[PDB]
Amino acid sequence: RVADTVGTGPTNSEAIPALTAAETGHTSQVVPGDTMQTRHVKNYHSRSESTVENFLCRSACVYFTEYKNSGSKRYAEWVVTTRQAAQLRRKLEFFTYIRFDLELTFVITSTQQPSTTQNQDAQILTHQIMYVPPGGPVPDKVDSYVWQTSTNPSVFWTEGNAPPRMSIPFLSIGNAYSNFYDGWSEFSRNGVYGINTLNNMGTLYARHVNTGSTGPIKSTIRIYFKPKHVKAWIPRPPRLCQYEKAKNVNFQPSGVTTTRQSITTMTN
């Protein structure tokens, strides 16, 4: 529960609560009752929505891609990375090291494409989403033998049902995730530089298990990430500039804030 105010009165002492030195870097712990007269009011407000969990514990779309039931692109692939979008990336970048379980949710939607084939009577489409850990046999084609998914995890969804959802544990060879890395892949300070060196989360694939209709159909899969059981360390300032790449922090220089008329202007 937030701290209640304390009632005070006038004062003519040698105690100087307001005067301090910020050279030390110590934030002054003064309350309004130190520089004025205050009443005593109980405070019932609560910092329950400001906790790390409630802050990052929401579903956010991190990618979406489109695959068809005919033509060239018969299946879709994605290299797992949370830097593809801006909103969740910027929320995560508040901290240097974060440890969290992941609740993955998938939304799949199909659409009939313009063609000229007559007599179109489709059937229900079923989709398969296969995750390959790094070092696995990646599908080279849509009718690949790798789709057996013996050891590899897979999820099968029929259109018209509730969206698929699964829970993934804290996967990392380290003791926490790293949002930032200040190093090189090689010990000789050459090669890949940045958080890309640490990244190694494998690839995710998706396909139509059946053609369904004699006409063209394009499907689109959306990936949603909700962090849970979150633990975080070392906070850092929010990204002032706009993001440009997913593999690096490269940016274009921007001003600290937005300009007003003069130093005595009450309006923007």
Binding site: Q242, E244, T259
Partner: protein
Amino acid sequence: CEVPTRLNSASLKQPYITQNYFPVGTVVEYECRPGYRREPSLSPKLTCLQNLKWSTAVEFCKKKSCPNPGEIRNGQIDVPGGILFGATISFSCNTGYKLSTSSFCLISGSSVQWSDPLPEC
């Protein structure tokens, strides 16, 4: 790369407007369309990235402010939408006086001014 992203605040600078071939690593510059004023913090440049996609673009210009409306004698001015470019103020009169009725903030030359002058009532 394709055509640079259209933005309400600014417009593509000459001669990029008359150009249709943009190789990778090509920078294009924008300019504030009327009235719109340039924002000093943001820089109006975009670069074609390797993925044949332009860099993130944000409004590099902001609407110009019309002057204060004034104070009509024996009258009430209604300002529902601020005094920015494209707003409309309403002129009314008190009970016991007879009164244009409205004025519009529009671009007139190099700046923005009100259209109808203050009436008499």
